[PDB]
Amino acid sequence: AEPTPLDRVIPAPASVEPGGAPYRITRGTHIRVDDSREARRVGDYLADLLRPATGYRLPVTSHGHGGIRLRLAEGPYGDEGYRLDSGREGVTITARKAAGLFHGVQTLRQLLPAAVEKDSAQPGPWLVAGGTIEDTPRYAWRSAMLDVSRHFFSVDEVKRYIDRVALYKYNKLHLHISDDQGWRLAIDSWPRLATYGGSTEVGGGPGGHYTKADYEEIVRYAASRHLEVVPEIDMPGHTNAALASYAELNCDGVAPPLYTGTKVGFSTLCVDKDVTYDFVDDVLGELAALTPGRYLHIGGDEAHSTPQADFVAFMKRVQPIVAKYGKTVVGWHQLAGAEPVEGALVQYWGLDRTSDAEKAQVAAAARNGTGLILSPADRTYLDMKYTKDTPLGLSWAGYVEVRRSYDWDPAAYLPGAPAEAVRGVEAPLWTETLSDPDQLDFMAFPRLPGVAELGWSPASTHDWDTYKVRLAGQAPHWEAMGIDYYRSPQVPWT
Ligand SMILES: CC(=O)N[C@H]1CN2CC[C@H](O)[C@@H]2[C@@H](O)[C@@H]1O
């Protein structure tokens, strides 16, 4: 075997300087970490990845021989970057914080042969190409969304999806935990939302919800994968589950039935009833107590049954509730037309046919200093069909093949918005049509690593013809990990 080339990694690393003979992990290699819990956690994570396929003991130690060295040190790598040095003497990953060590490990696993992901002992050799990678991200907002409201996904399925996104240096997990078809978090001040509002899902299945303990475990697990959880309570539209659970929240005071279909636009909270804000205050307060992350997403899309002036007055009242609990507002880009507060981010989900006036409104807010998360429906929506023949997913945004999802520049995308306003990107996975985790993987892969690269990699590394060869190189690893994926004909799979 020869080593996988040092640059064959997604995201493309910011700097790659290949040179010298490779490191070879052998029966005597140790994983040497600084003397601390933060250090041992990353070392034990790495050992868990490497022990099954190598069959080596790979002790995590703070003394002795090393071979794979994980070290924290001051340096120019910021909060999330790292340097990886590899040669005959060993592999050393250096960073300022545990998050850059963890990022360096996600790089190290792609450098290693695909057999590394197997769950039993495999022949070597275990080669890491020689040279130096120095790597820091282009954008700080690099996120993946999972809709657990349309179809429910369990704590264990969400942890499996966290492990998918952690491969590619995503650092935010947006969980869409409420919509018309379900409410997915126990709220003590409004107990019916989860108990009744969570009792079904699209298609009339058993639905589900996270207890407070379940939600804490999802947050703790994602943190151990350096993902900051960004929960969304969508409002004032996409609220049927909440309205069905509490008659008083409805303008007419009558609870609609639980909804199991896939239409949108029809539900609204009652903007002129004060009890609506008792409900928002209580839910956001309880969600904030469970959210160590900095952001609360209040949604704001498809409020088609809410008059514009009511939508504006609603967001005027609700956004300060987020600041009252010490968090920052994120909304879908409809919020740009309703006075985003200072610090608020908007998430653009539009597409090429979105009207010019609507695009100009979002760009106006960006010029006004509103930060922008880009997730265009005809680029990074992972539920969008690849072609007319994809058996799952939607096509309201057109067909989105692998090249189209990758081949754009978040810095030069929305006309009239400054580059400086772009906080980063997100890849959302909506679940109207997806009800099991193998289906999630088929729709998420192979576009998911592409959005991760847009978030992470320098613009100077961006290039379809050479990226598609790095993407083809992931397939053997996916196959060893058991990850289903769409074998696009645009990619030169080996
Ligand atoms: C933010 C967002 O994409 N909202 C809705 C946007 N709509 C547009 C058409 C679909 O119903 C789609 C739906 O799946 C999504 O939930």
In ligand 1, the atom with minimum distance to the C-alpha of 430 is 14
Resolution (A): 2.0
Indicate the domain borders of the chain: 1-136, 138-458
Mutate which of 146, 230, 301 for ligand 1 pocket (most atoms within 8 A of beta carbon) = 301
Residue 248 Cα, ligand 1 centroid: separation in angstroms? 27
Cis geometry, peptide bond prior to residue 236 (ω within 30 degrees of 0): yes
Instruction: Identify the CATH homologous superfamily for domain 138-458.
Output: Glycosidases (3.20.20.80)
Residue 182 Cα, ligand 1 centroid: separation in angstroms? 15
- Which residue's alpha carbon is nearest to atom 4 within ligand 1? 301
Q: Tell whether ligand 1 has an atom less than 6 A from the beta carbon of residue 302.
A: yes
How far, in Å, CA of 12 to CA of 27, rounded? 30
Strand segments (E) across 307-417: 328-332, 345-348, 371-374
Nearest to 107 by CA among 68, 60, 144: 68
Tell me 25's DSSP state: E
150 near 262, Cβ under 8 Å? yes
Count Cβ neighbours within 10 Å for each residue of 114-138 and write b for 16 or more, e otherwise: bbbbeeeebebebbbbbbbbbbbbb
Contacts (Cβ under 8 Å, ≥6 apart) of 285: 321, 325
Count Cβ neighbours within 10 Å for each residue of 187-226 and write b for 16 or more, e otherwise: beebebbbebbbbbbbeeeebbbbeeebbebbbebbebbb
How far, in Å, CA of 92 to CA of 83, rounded? 8
| Unique residue bearing structure tokens 């920052």 | 328
Technique that determined the structure = X-ray
- Which residue's alpha carbon is nearest to atom 8 within ligand 1? 396
Confirm whether 1-136 and 138-458 share one CATH topology: no
Q: Tell whether ligand 1 has an atom less than 6 A from the beta carbon of residue 432.
A: yes
Q: How far apart are the first and last CA of the chain?
A: 16
Q: Tell whether ligand 1 has an atom less than 6 A from the beta carbon of residue 396.
A: yes
Residues marked as catalytic: 302
- The CATH number for 1-136, chosen from 3.40.718.10, 3.30.379.10, 3.65.10.10, 3.10.20.440, is 3.30.379.10
- Which residue's alpha carbon is nearest to atom 1 within ligand 1? 301
